[PDB]
Design an enzyme around this catalytic site. Sequence first.
Site, short mmCIF file in Angstrom:
data_model
loop_
_atom_site.label_atom_id
_atom_site.label_comp_id
_atom_site.label_asym_id
_atom_site.label_seq_id
_atom_site.Cartn_x
_atom_site.Cartn_y
_atom_site.Cartn_z
N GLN A 83 0.81 -1.24 0.00
CA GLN A 83 -0.08 0.08 0.01
C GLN A 83 1.07 1.26 -0.16
OE1 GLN A 83 0.43 -2.64 2.58
NE2 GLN A 83 -1.75 -2.66 2.67
N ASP A 101 -4.13 1.26 -2.67
CA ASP A 101 -4.69 2.30 -1.61
C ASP A 101 -4.70 3.84 -1.85
OD1 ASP A 101 -5.25 0.06 -0.13
OD2 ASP A 101 -4.15 0.56 1.58
N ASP A 130 -8.27 -1.32 -3.66
CA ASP A 130 -8.87 -0.51 -2.69
C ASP A 130 -8.40 0.89 -2.86
OD1 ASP A 130 -9.64 -3.16 -1.72
OD2 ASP A 130 -8.44 -3.05 -0.08
N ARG A 183 -2.51 -4.47 -14.55
CA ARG A 183 -1.57 -5.25 -13.54
C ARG A 183 -0.97 -6.20 -14.30
NH1 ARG A 183 -3.70 -6.24 -7.91
NH2 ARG A 183 -1.57 -7.36 -7.60
N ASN A 236 -7.95 -13.78 -13.18
CA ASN A 236 -7.80 -13.39 -11.84
C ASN A 236 -8.07 -11.78 -11.60
OD1 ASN A 236 -7.23 -15.79 -10.81
ND2 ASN A 236 -5.16 -15.39 -10.35
N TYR A 286 -9.88 -3.35 -6.96
CA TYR A 286 -11.27 -2.99 -6.57
C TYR A 286 -11.12 -1.40 -6.32
CZ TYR A 286 -10.34 -7.46 -4.80
OH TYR A 286 -10.26 -9.02 -4.90
N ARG A 317 -15.26 -3.88 -2.02
CA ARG A 317 -15.35 -4.75 -1.26
C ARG A 317 -15.31 -4.28 0.33
NH1 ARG A 317 -9.25 -7.89 -1.13
NH2 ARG A 317 -8.06 -5.79 -0.91
N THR A 338 -8.71 -3.73 11.18
CA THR A 338 -8.09 -4.34 12.49
C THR A 338 -8.26 -3.39 13.44
OG1 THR A 338 -6.80 -6.12 11.26
CG2 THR A 338 -6.19 -5.17 13.64
O1 LIG Z 1 -7.30 3.70 14.64
C1 LIG Z 1 -6.42 4.13 13.87
O2 LIG Z 1 -6.40 5.12 13.29
C2 LIG Z 1 -5.50 2.98 13.53
O3 LIG Z 1 -4.59 3.30 12.37
C3 LIG Z 1 -3.66 2.45 12.05
O4 LIG Z 1 -4.23 1.74 10.99
C4 LIG Z 1 -4.67 1.38 9.63
C5 LIG Z 1 -6.02 0.40 9.98
O5 LIG Z 1 -6.83 1.23 10.63
C6 LIG Z 1 -5.50 -0.77 10.56
O6 LIG Z 1 -6.73 -1.68 10.57
C7 LIG Z 1 -4.77 -1.55 9.65
O7 LIG Z 1 -5.06 -1.86 8.31
C8 LIG Z 1 -4.21 -2.90 7.59
C9 LIG Z 1 -3.66 -2.47 6.28
O8 LIG Z 1 -2.67 -1.37 6.50
C10 LIG Z 1 -4.67 -1.54 5.60
O9 LIG Z 1 -3.99 -1.05 4.20
C11 LIG Z 1 -5.66 -2.75 5.00
O10 LIG Z 1 -5.31 -3.75 4.25
C12 LIG Z 1 -6.17 -4.24 3.32
C13 LIG Z 1 -6.09 -6.10 3.89
O11 LIG Z 1 -6.61 -6.08 4.86
C14 LIG Z 1 -4.54 -6.42 3.65
O12 LIG Z 1 -4.48 -7.78 3.98
C15 LIG Z 1 -4.10 -6.03 2.31
O13 LIG Z 1 -4.80 -6.95 1.37
C16 LIG Z 1 -4.41 -8.10 0.60
C17 LIG Z 1 -3.33 -7.50 -0.73
O14 LIG Z 1 -2.34 -6.59 -0.26
C18 LIG Z 1 -4.00 -6.86 -1.57
O15 LIG Z 1 -3.27 -6.84 -3.02
C19 LIG Z 1 -5.15 -7.90 -2.18
O16 LIG Z 1 -5.08 -9.13 -3.03
C20 LIG Z 1 -5.18 -10.02 -4.18
C21 LIG Z 1 -6.52 -10.66 -3.71
O17 LIG Z 1 -7.69 -9.82 -3.75
C22 LIG Z 1 -6.43 -11.66 -2.73
O18 LIG Z 1 -7.66 -12.50 -2.87
C23 LIG Z 1 -5.20 -12.64 -2.93
O19 LIG Z 1 -5.50 -13.54 -4.02
O20 LIG Z 1 -4.01 -11.93 -3.23
C24 LIG Z 1 -4.10 -11.01 -4.15
C25 LIG Z 1 -2.82 -10.35 -4.58
O21 LIG Z 1 -1.69 -10.14 -3.56
O22 LIG Z 1 -2.46 -9.63 -5.44
O23 LIG Z 1 -6.10 -8.29 -0.99
C26 LIG Z 1 -5.41 -8.83 0.01
C27 LIG Z 1 -6.23 -9.07 1.17
O24 LIG Z 1 -7.64 -8.99 1.00
O25 LIG Z 1 -5.72 -9.54 2.32
O26 LIG Z 1 -4.15 -4.65 1.98
C28 LIG Z 1 -5.56 -4.30 2.06
C29 LIG Z 1 -5.67 -2.78 1.51
O27 LIG Z 1 -6.44 -2.11 1.67
O28 LIG Z 1 -4.67 -2.44 0.76
O29 LIG Z 1 -6.32 -3.20 6.35
C30 LIG Z 1 -5.46 -3.95 7.08
C31 LIG Z 1 -6.09 -4.49 8.53
O30 LIG Z 1 -7.35 -4.38 8.58
O31 LIG Z 1 -5.40 -5.19 9.36
O32 LIG Z 1 -3.39 -0.84 9.60
C32 LIG Z 1 -3.75 0.60 8.90
C33 LIG Z 1 -2.19 1.29 9.00
O33 LIG Z 1 -2.27 2.32 8.46
O34 LIG Z 1 -1.39 0.52 9.11
C34 LIG Z 1 -2.63 2.22 13.09
O35 LIG Z 1 -1.68 1.00 13.01
C35 LIG Z 1 -3.53 1.55 14.43
O36 LIG Z 1 -2.71 0.95 15.58
C36 LIG Z 1 -4.60 2.55 14.81
O37 LIG Z 1 -4.00 3.71 15.26
#
Ligand SMILES: O=C(O)[C@H]1O[C@H](O[C@@H]2[C@H](O)[C@@H](O)[C@@H](O[C@@H]3[C@H](O)[C@@H](O)[C@@H](O[C@@H]4[C@H](O)[C@@H](O)[C@@H](O[C@@H]5[C@H](O)[C@@H](O)[C@@H](O[C@@H]6[C@H](O)[C@@H](O)[C@@H](O)O[C@@H]6C(=O)O)O[C@@H]5C(=O)O)O[C@@H]4C(=O)O)O[C@@H]3C(=O)O)O[C@@H]2C(=O)O)[C@H](O)[C@@H](O)[C@H]1O
Length: 342
Positions: free
Chosen positions: A129, A154, A175, A195, A202, A206, A243, A248
């Site tokens: 991201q 992102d 996203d 991509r 695939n 989103y 989506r 978290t």
């Molecule tokens: O209260 C606060 O303010 C808070 O702030 C911080 O936090 C934020 C956030 O609030 C936290 O919850 C956390 O977030 C995580 C992450 O940083 C954020 O971008 C988002 O991420 C999404 C997914 O959860 C991730 O797993 C990731 O997605 C992957 C892949 O990267 C993506 O390419 C894709 O993949 C495709 C397919 O869709 C898949 O099915 C598979 O086949 O792989 C392929 C591929 O690789 O190409 O989707 C996957 C997936 O779905 O898992 O990225 C997602 C995204 O949106 O980009 O949410 C995360 C989470 O919920 O945990 O952290 C944030 C941050 O800023 O770090 C502070 O850290 C916290 O303490 C608090 O202060």
Amino acid sequence: ATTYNAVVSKSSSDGKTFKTIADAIASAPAGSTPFVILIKNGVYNERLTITRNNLHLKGESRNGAVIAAATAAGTLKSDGSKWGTAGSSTITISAKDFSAQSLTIRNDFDFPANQAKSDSDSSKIKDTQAVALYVTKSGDRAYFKDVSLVGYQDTLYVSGGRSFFSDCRISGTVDFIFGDGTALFNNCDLVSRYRADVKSGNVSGYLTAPSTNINQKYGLVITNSRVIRESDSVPAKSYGLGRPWHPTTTFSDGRYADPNAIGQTVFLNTSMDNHIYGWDKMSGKDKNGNTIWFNPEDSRFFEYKSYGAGATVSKDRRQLTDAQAAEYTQSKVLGDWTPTLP
Ligand SMILES: O=C(O)[C@H]1O[C@H](O[C@@H]2[C@H](O)[C@@H](O)[C@@H](O[C@@H]3[C@H](O)[C@@H](O)[C@@H](O[C@@H]4[C@H](O)[C@@H](O)[C@@H](O[C@@H]5[C@H](O)[C@@H](O)[C@@H](O[C@@H]6[C@H](O)[C@@H](O)[C@@H](O)O[C@@H]6C(=O)O)O[C@@H]5C(=O)O)O[C@@H]4C(=O)O)O[C@@H]3C(=O)O)O[C@@H]2C(=O)O)[C@H](O)[C@@H](O)[C@H]1O
């Protein structure tokens, strides 16, 4: 009487101009009086965190006035720790009544080059991201007119309050509009990018991943816009409209995907090319540490009079009634705030 309080340019032979945008902002008097900065054409390699209320940036042109930096969530700082998603942002808005007009904000993290790296390459980042613009919970009433936002994963992070994007371009892959904010987009081009790393058949990405709290009336609202592909190489049925992002979050019983972040994405009178297949699900970790899927049918995902090849009406693509659509006017979405430029 649209005069400027400070002018930024690349030329020293310009006059009494600031070399950097950070230095022009610095010149602003303390407090909350309106301060308007003209940014002349050029690429400004700066990261900014806006903390002054009532600040206004105006680029000479959207094409030519650029604010750019390259930072991924997995990019390491001096202490060797990660920036993280929020921390990756080129521009962070943590004040009220901000506006930007006629300029481009990029994250220049080279996602495709990163993905092309060998798996054994230690410099290949997993946390891909890389946020161009982040409007925070402290950034209510943020207005972007004729602004371009560039990134891959992102691109735009919208959290907390209300933001309005008008006559805009936003590009990305996964996203690329995400968060829990009330964000209204009118007359925008939303550009789904090619991509190289994704196999035929695939999902490439989103458009939205809303995390809108269930008790919040409006999340991501997209009106009179154009959902387009970056190139002919972007395959048919490769992109989801949204989506459900359940971030978290730390609760009294542990840290896990927020059950109440039941996101809203609504498209009204928006064209869609056939790269769009519909809505999709998203996974997180529940209170027990198990995988949990959040489904689009359980989320606030709606369309009203979509058109173009990507605009199917089916059971899996819920449609607003005319009466429901009237709830998504600018006045209703933005409440007591009327976006205005200085
Ligand atoms: O209260 C606060 O303010 C808070 O702030 C911080 O936090 C934020 C956030 O609030 C936290 O919850 C956390 O977030 C995580 C992450 O940083 C954020 O971008 C988002 O991420 C999404 C997914 O959860 C991730 O797993 C990731 O997605 C992957 C892949 O990267 C993506 O390419 C894709 O993949 C495709 C397919 O869709 C898949 O099915 C598979 O086949 O792989 C392929 C591929 O690789 O190409 O989707 C996957 C997936 O779905 O898992 O990225 C997602 C995204 O949106 O980009 O949410 C995360 C989470 O919920 O945990 O952290 C944030 C941050 O800023 O770090 C502070 O850290 C916290 O303490 C608090 O202060």
